[PDB]
Amino acid sequence: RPLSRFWEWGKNIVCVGRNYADHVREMRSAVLSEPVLFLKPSTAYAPEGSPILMPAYTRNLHHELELGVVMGKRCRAVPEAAAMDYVGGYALCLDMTARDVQDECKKKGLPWTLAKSFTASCPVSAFVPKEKIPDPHKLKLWLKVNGELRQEGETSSMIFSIPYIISYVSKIITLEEGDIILTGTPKGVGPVKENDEIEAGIHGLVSMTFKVEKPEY
Amino acid sequence: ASRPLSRFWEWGKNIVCVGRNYADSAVLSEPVLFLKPSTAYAPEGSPILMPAYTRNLHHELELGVVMGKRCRAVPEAAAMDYVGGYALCLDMTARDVQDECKKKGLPWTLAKSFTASCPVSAFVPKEKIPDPHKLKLWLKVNGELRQEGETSSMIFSIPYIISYVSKIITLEEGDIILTGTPKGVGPVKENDEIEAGIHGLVSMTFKVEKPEY
Numbered sequence: 001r002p003l004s005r006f007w008e009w010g011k012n013i014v015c016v017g018r019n020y021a022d023h024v025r026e027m028r029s030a031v032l033s034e035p036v037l038f039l040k041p042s043t044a045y046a047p048e049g050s051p052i053l054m055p056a057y058t059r060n061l062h063h064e065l066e067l068g069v070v071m072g073k074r075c076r077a078v079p080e081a082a083a084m085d086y087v088g089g090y091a092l093c094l095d096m097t098a099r100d101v102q103d104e105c106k107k108k109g110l111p112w113t114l115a116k117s118f119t120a121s122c123p124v125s126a127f128v129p130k131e132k133i134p135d136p137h138k139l140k141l142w143l144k145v146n147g148e149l150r151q152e153g154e155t156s157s158m159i160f161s162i163p164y165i166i167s168y169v170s171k172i173i174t175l176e177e178g179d180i181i182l183t184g185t186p187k188g189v190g191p192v193k194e195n196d197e198i199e200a201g202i203h204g205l206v207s208m209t210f211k212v213e214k215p216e217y
Numbered sequence: 218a219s220r221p222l223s224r225f226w227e228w229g230k231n232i233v234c235v236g237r238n239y240a241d242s243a244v245l246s247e248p249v250l251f252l253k254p255s256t257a258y259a260p261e262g263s264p265i266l267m268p269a270y271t272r273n274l275h276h277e278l279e280l281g282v283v284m285g286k287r288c289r290a291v292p293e294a295a296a297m298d299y300v301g302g303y304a305l306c307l308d309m310t311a312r313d314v315q316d317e318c319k320k321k322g323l324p325w326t327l328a329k330s331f332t333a334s335c336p337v338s339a340f341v342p343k344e345k346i347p348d349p350h351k352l353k354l355w356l357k358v359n360g361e362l363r364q365e366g367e368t369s370s371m372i373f374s375i376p377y378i379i380s381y382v383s384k385i386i387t388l389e390e391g392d393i394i395l396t397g398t399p400k401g402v403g404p405v406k407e408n409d410e411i412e413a414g415i416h417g418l419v420s421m422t423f424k425v426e427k428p429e430y
């Protein structure tokens with residue numbers, strides 16, 4: 001029920017591939033191709049207080065800073081123009097990525113599961129109600145690793161609008177209340193190692209902190 | 218309100234699927250894994266929905282293992298303790314799309330993970346299946362037998378699959394693992410009727426439809 005704890009009860013996590021233009025020239029072109037989609041299991045969620053867990057099989061774990069859009073009602077094959085009506089709110093997420101594994105998956109034509117969909121691969125902020133974000137395309141996202149800025153992005157740089165992404169996703173996969181869509185990452189993706197501290201936020205709206213750990217199991 | 222295992226498709230969060238797991242070499246490789254969203258579930262009474270972007274929708278008859286306890290990095294030797302029961306599933310597959318995904322190194326999502334891509338039987342409690350490697354699975358299309366398989370032919374055991382999966386992805390109560398398909402996969406078209414079962418345990422029937430929305 002309560003969206004303020006959506007990661008406890010939400011079933012599904014859908015993530016887009018590329019959705020940020022580093023330069024206006026990338027709008028002039030990238031729009032001609034649909035967004036790539038992949039899934040994370042509900043057990044990817046790592047709410048604040050829980051660690052980023054480094055999978056045992058990677059030597060190149062990357063952060064990807066992303067705005068997540070939390071669905072407030074069941075959303076099946078909706079038009080772009082109705083999509084915002086299905087949104088409950090937002091959360092800042094990291095699409096944690098085993099980049100070495102991802103390269104292997106791509107090369108061999110394998111699913112991206114071990115690269116993208118492992119336990120604790122979706123660190124997630126507190127929920128932000130949609131009332132606080134009247135325009136999700138006018139947000140500024142930032143991420144630091146051990147105090148150094150690694151990603152900074154404006155959601156005004158998105159290739160596809162959030163309503164378009166919702167619509168497109170909903171035509172392939174029905175979204176349930178409490179499902180989240182991760183809407184892509186600005187430039188600056190890069191690695192983290194054991195004991196690194198990640199701090200990230202949406203300016204004026206939400207702050208989060210995650211420590212990178214190896215599992216104790 | 219209630220969340221019995223008998224209705225696990227209503228409340229279960231996650232669906233994990235293995236790639237190849239039936240022996241016609243393969244042992245030398247770990248199992249391939251991909252996900253389906255909870256909205257892939259199509260319980261009996263709901264249609265198999267043809268995605269608009271495929272011209273080659275395949276049935277894949279599979280035994281699903283429904284988890285009964287939260288299962289994180291469990292050893293093969295304890296894996297069966299985390300099972301709640303079973304369900305017969307179809308891993309509905311846009312095979313044309315899958316070929317393109319493999320060639321281009323894309324996720325398998327549009328091929329494997331679409332709305333209604335997991336037709337699912339009634340729940341079978343674990344007590345009724347003391348050995349899930351001694352089952353017979355069958356599938357008919359318009360009354361003609363198209364897949365028949367023995368789960369004794371599995372490459373990887375169910376406990377090994379549970380262990381392996383649980384080391385990558387924690388499984389919650391009500392999550393399901395689809396354990397692969399025997400030979401005979403093939404296409405279906407609009408208005409086809411699919412009947413399938415686990416011999417002596419469960420059967421189901423589904424119509425192939427285009428969405429009315």
Ligand SMILES: [Cl-]
Nearest residue numbers: 111112324325
């Ligand atoms: Cl995938």
Ligand SMILES: [Mg+2]
Nearest residue numbers: 064095184185
């Ligand atoms: Mg991403």
Ligand SMILES: [Mg+2]
Nearest residue numbers: 011012230231
């Ligand atoms: Mg799920």
Ligand SMILES: [Mg+2]
Nearest residue numbers: 277308397398
């Ligand atoms: Mg399959």
